[PDB]
Amino acid sequence: SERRLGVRAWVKENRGSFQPPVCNKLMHQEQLKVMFIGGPNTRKDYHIEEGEEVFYQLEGDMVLRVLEQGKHRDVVIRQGEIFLLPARVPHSPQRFANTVGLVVERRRLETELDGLRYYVGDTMDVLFEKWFYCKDLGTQLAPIIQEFFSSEQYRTGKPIPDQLLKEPPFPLSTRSIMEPMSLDAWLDSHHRELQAGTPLSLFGDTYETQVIAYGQGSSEGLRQNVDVWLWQLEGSSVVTMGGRRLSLAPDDSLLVLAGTSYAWERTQGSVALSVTQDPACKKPLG
Ligand code: NI
Question: Phi/psi at 270 (nearest 5 deg)?
């Protein structure tokens, strides 16, 4: 499978992407968008979307500025920490030199709208906003950012009230945001259960996204209409798919495309993640 990639190997191969002006590179761009991002890249724009975003820092720390329950808050995500952002939280990622982060998000439904907002200084007053149907976030954000920097609102620093929406196209999240957690420490604290053959959800049932940890054991994967990204963190496994068996060695990842039947056999001491973002599991509100 051309979708089996060693994560650190792929980062090394693409190392020049993780600095300005490029900063980011998509590993997979299908129903799941699996992307890696470097820095430095600091910014004042807040992204808003109807799906969730998974963040994991492979190298170095970042700061995700969020608007949480009507206030500005900085979420520091340190090297080795994983964090899940719920739907419809405005967020502004700040990245530093010589860092590498994973972000996972999903293809939007035809009905879902993305927004990009700038605020007046550190206040909750909106300065400028643009809403759009997101097909390729990076491609589409460049012209929007250029529009802001060319705008009267940027020139004056003052909102033009008639240039704002009376209300967003959907309610912004009113959820509190979780504390990032050490992935290694979480896996260590749950290791007996994992290796006893009980896969565990990292974040639980109140999110759309499921990030699930697995130890030794076997699984069957049914043909779903969403992608699944597997990451074999430690140890090895074998995936049976398309009439072939393929091994995942330590640090291999595999995107299993929507529509694929598969089986998965994980060896002693092995630890893996799966990531799914199924829009059918979207939270109706909140
Ligand atoms: Ni985002």
Answer: -70, 150
